[PDB]
Structure formats: structure tokens, C-alpha cells
């Protein structure tokens, strides 16, 4: 019995808890962009749209005796909005395994859920770094008001240091001086692990002093690619309405399908706080 009908919930409370903990742990081990981006407060599942403010140019403060200067930014004539998507992945559970776990106390195995969570995290990172042409989203490597600098030769040591100082100078010439963060592909990240004879240490350690907010690697980046960003809530952030969670989809062919899902969007308010190599 209990497999001869159609149920609302096929699992017990402890199994639900274990499933959720597994999903959370895999996500925390796999995510990257949440280490360099701030999170605009979590809104709720009912919220499906957020404002998309875009600022251009440089506007500085003022120093004077009597405060009779404007020094205020103006709203865009348009003030566009954008829609928050859904990112999800599905997995399956067989009913005879559940039957064994309840008749002869054999522990339940949830490795398919871990696989689905890993794939969902990879999808989120792909959406952050590149965009979505059919949905009209832009990523960090495809923004239009972004700065660019040539990569140069990294086969010999010192090439990495030359490119990151040039990128920081280009970001300097636009009014952005905050702590920088660097993200690289595996070829560049591995090539930065040699000894620099001009310093006597590993080349990665000088760039870690230059950045001071982090040097990371991501397998979403293609070939030899890298990005340097100036961090801060006023330049870019992540608006999330619902964090990663799991949901039962209803029985089909006597088996049990589930979904892991989340809802978030990336907001780039200052497109010149980026620089791609």
C-alpha cells in the first residue's frame, strides 16, 4: 500500500531536512558570483519586477563655505524595469527505494538532488557572466558601456601584472578607485602560479595585493578571458526574490519527480566599473 494511490507528499520530515541541507551545501560549494556581488534584499516569490536604474558620466561632491551648489543626480527620462526569471533543474526518485527505506530501515540516497543542485548553480553562474539573447539580459562579459584592454603574452612571468595595472589605470581614468576584484579562466589562473624572478615569490601573490577584494577562477569563462570589476552596491548587485529550494512535482509513472529552483537577476547600474581582458 501507499504506492497504489496518488499522494500529496511522498517523504518524511527528516528526509526533507536532509534534502534541503544537501542542496544548500552543494550550492555554497559551487557558487562564485555571490563572492564578488552584493545582494539587494530578498523580496519574495510574489515579486516579479524590479527597477533598472542606469547612470552615466562622473559627478563629484563639493567643498565650500555655504552650501549653494547642486551636486545631485537626476532620474533617467525612461526609468526602465526588468523581469526576474526562474532557474531550475529536475531529478527523479524510484518508489521501491522508498519502500525499502520504510520496511527494512535502509537509509535514503539523495545524490541525484546534489547533481541537480550543481547543475542549477552552474546555470546561475552562466547567467551572471553571460546574458540571455532571447530574454534580453546582459552579462559582465557582454555589457555595452564596458572598458576593454588587450590581454598580452602570459607565457612569460610578469604578463599578468602588466595587464592588471593597465586595466586599473583605465578604470582610474573614469572616476572609479574602489577595491578591485579579478576573475580569470583556468588557463590564466594556472599560469599565474609560477615564481616571478623580479620579486622572488609567486606571481599570484602580487595580484592578490593589487586587487585586495579577490582573485578567482570560473570555468564559465571561455579560452583565455578575464574581468576586473570595481565593487560596491552603487555599481552592480544581485536582486533575488527566492533562494534555492526544492519542490515536489507530483507523481508520474509511479515514480517521484522533484525540482530545484531559484529566482534572481543581475543589475549593472554603472557599466564603466568593468574592464574585460
Amino acid at each position: 500500500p501507499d504506492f497504489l494511490g496518488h499522494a500529496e507528499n511522498p517523504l518524511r520530515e527528516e528526509e526533507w531536512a536532509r534534502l534541503n541541507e544537501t542542496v544548500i551545501q552543494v550550492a555554497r560549494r559551487s557558487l562564485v558570483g555571490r563572492r564578488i556581488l552584493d545582494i539587494y534584499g530578498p523580496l519574495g516569490a510574489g515579486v516579479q519586477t524590479v527597477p533598472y536604474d542606469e547612470f552615466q558620466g562622473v559627478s563629484p561632491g563639493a567643498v565650500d563655505i555655504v552650501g549653494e551648489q547642486e551636486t545631485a543626480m537626476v532620474f533617467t527620462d525612461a526609468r526602465k524595469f526588468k523581469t526576474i526569471p526562474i532557474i531550475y533543474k529536475d531529478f527523479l526518485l524510484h518508489w521501491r527505494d522508498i519502500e525499502a527505506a520504510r520496511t527494512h530501515n535502509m537509509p535514503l540516497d539523495v545524490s541525484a538532488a546534489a547533481g541537480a543542485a550543481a547543475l542549477c548553480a552552474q546555470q546561475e553562474d552562466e547567467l551572471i557572466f553571460y546574458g540571455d539573447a532571447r530574454l534580453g539580459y546582459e552579462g559582465l562579459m557582454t555589457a555595452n558601456g564596458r572598458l576593454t584592454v588587450p590581454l598580452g603574452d602570459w607565457t612569460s612571468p610578469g604578463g599578468g601584472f602588466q595587464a592588471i595595472v593597465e586595466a586599473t589605470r583605465k578604470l582610474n581614468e573614469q572616476g572609479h578607485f574602489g577595491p578591485y576584484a579579478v576573475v580569470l579562466s583556468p588557463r590564466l589562473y594556472s599560469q599565474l602560479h609560477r615564481i616571478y624572478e623580479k620579486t622572488g615569490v609567486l606571481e599570484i601573490e602580487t595580484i592578490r595585493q593589487l586587487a585586495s577584494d579577490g582573485v578567482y577562477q570560473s570555468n564559465r569563462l571561455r579560452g583565455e578571458s578575464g574581468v576586473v570589476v570595481s565593487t560596491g552596491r552603487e555599481n552592480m548587485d544581485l536582486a533575488v526574490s527566492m533562494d534555492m529550494v526544492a519542490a515536489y512535482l507530483g507523481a508520474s509513472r509511479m515514480n517521484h519527480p522533484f525540482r530545484v529552483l531559484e529566482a534572481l537577476l543581475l543589475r549593472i547600474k554603472h557599466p564603466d566599473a568593468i574592464c574585460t581582458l
Binding site: 555554497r28 557558487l31 545582494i39
Partner: peptide, 10 residues
């Protein structure tokens, strides 16, 4: 109450 799960990683 609405809460985060994975949470902030900064």
C-alpha cells in the same frame, strides 16, 4: 518570515 537559504558569500 522570508529568509535566505544559501545566503551571502561575501
Amino acid at each position: 518570515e522570508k529568509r535566505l537559504t544559501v545566503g551571502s558569500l561575501r
